[PDB]
Amino acid sequence: ERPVRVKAWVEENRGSFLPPVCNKLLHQKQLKIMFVGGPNTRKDYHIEEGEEVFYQLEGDMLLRVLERGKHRDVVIRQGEIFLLPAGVPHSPQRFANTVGLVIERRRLKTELDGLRYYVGDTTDVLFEKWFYCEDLGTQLAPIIQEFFSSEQYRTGKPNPDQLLKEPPFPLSTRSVMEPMCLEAWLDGHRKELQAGTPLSLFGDTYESQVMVHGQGSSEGLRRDVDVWLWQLEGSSVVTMEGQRLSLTLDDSLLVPAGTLYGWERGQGSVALSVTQDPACKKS
Ligand SMILES: [Fe+3]
């Protein structure tokens, strides 16, 4: 339209979260920006070669992970933000009356997504499926149905003929971070943002870059990947192709790869800048 105001977009589009996945995409080019409501129980663990960034807009969630072969529970509460590194199996439980933000990116021609259901709360695979992920809005469903309409589900015995000897790429062995409370973080760094220096939220051992920007401007910029901007405080002006688009509180905007842009940020503004560039992949 664009900018799109995030809470107005959610409040309008939440009547279209449909089971089993309860998701709807805002954007689906190089960057994928999607929202998911609950209640919604996922018994499956997803594995992918890109990174996933979560931010809880409304209410809490529970992310179950496998971190070095061990089950782990990761509560992400309203206002918290968290980055999941590549190749970690994860299973998101969302509860009644919650809305969440998830970001990911388009997968390379050779990258492979997988789904696994385990036996009980053990680490033994019961059922798995591996596929090229093209359309985040549409492909998990058919996979989930297949598990619920299956012998493995009816009985709980794995069929060894349908397991893989090894996963197609080695699962990650890194540890997972703690969720950060975004606005305790902002207030914690407000002096630096007033100064004009942008800041990395998660640092550079990841592919994703979540940069926070305060007052000031920056020169003509052209990136090879999509960029998403989200205005949290104050306001700002984006310039792309002889075209000023101003952003106010809670406005957001995807600048498409290739597109040349200037950004002017007014007094006491605070904007979020997100990028997932697979040239910055960490394997
Ligand atoms: Fe996932």
Method of elucidation: X-ray
Length of the chain: 283
Q: What are phi and psi of 228, to 5 degrees?
A: -115, 130
Our count of domains for the chain comes to 1
Q: Let me know: does 132 contact 115? Beta carbons within 8 Å.
A: no
Boundaries of domain holding 94: 1-283
Q: Is 106 annotated as a binding residue?
A: no
Q: Is 116 annotated as a binding residue?
A: no
The data reach a resolution, in angstroms, of 2.5
Q: What are phi and psi of 240, to 5 degrees?
A: -140, 125
CATH of the domain at 207: 2.60.120.10
Compute, in angstroms, the gap from residue 223 CA to the centroid of ligand 1: 25
Give the separation between CA 212 and CA 173, rounded to whole angstroms. Answer: 29
Q: Is 42 annotated as a binding residue?
A: yes
| 3-state helix/strand/coil string of 109-136 | CCCCEEEEEECCCCCCEEEEEEECCCCC
